[PDB]
Design a protein around this ligand. Structure first.
Ligand SMILES: c1ccc([C@@H]2Nc3ccccc3-c3nc4ccccc4n32)nc1
Ligand SMILES: c1ccc([C@@H]2Nc3ccccc3-c3nc4ccccc4n32)nc1
Length: 147
């Protein structure tokens, strides 16, 4: 369909350039990277400090480029533990200018009692879906290790 084709054009023009995660209370950077963890079809991996699980909230900065215009760029993310969804998060960025580069800041609040890092590590998958409005542009997964 015309929509399948537009989703592929948007994905072809998209890159996640860099990202970081901070403790929202202190501001300190807990994780950073420059690889595009949203590329579909391969399982990505990330190692995060275990103490991130004790944060009341984490702030994310996500820097991305897009050749295509988007009217309502947004994300749906699911935290899966051994295949079961524990939490779902929704975030909206909105309009994206064609051929722009953009930094998107989001706050992720903890929900309700966290299992220990040693039980979670290697058993959490974050599934990220990027949309333009109701159009699914890509689905990607990162497996998390807590260190
Ligand atoms: C390190 C850790 C988790 C991710 C994961 N995976 C992601 C992949 C593409 C874009 C954003 C993320 C991301 N946002 C997160 C917010 C809270 C917890 C995990 C989150 N992710 N990426 C790198
Ligand atoms: C604050 C906000 C969200 C979470 C969230 N909450 C989680 C709930 C169940 C399993 C894993 C997580 C989780 N892994 C994370 C890796 C990086 C950042 C946040 C992460 N989480 N933890 C503290």
């Amino acid at each position: 369909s015309a929509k399948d084709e537009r989703a592929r054009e948007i994905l072809r023009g998209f890159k996640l350039n860099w990202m970081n995660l901070r403790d929202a209370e202190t501001g300190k950077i807990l994780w950073q990277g420059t690889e595009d963890l949203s590329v579909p079809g391969v399982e990505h991996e990330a190692r995060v400090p275990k103490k991130i699980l004790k944060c009341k909230a984490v702030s994310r900065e996500l820097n991305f480029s897009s050749t295509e215009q988007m009217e309502k760029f947004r994300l749906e993310q699911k935290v899966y533990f051994k295949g079961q969804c524990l939490e779902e998060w929704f975030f909206e960025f909105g309009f994206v200018i064609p051929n722009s580069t953009n930094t998107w800041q989001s706050l992720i609040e903890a929900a309700s009692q966290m299992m220990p890092a040693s039980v979670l590590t290697g058993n959490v998958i974050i599934e990220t879906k990027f949309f333009d409005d109701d159009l699914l542009v890509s689905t990607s997964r990162v497996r998390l290790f807590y260190v």
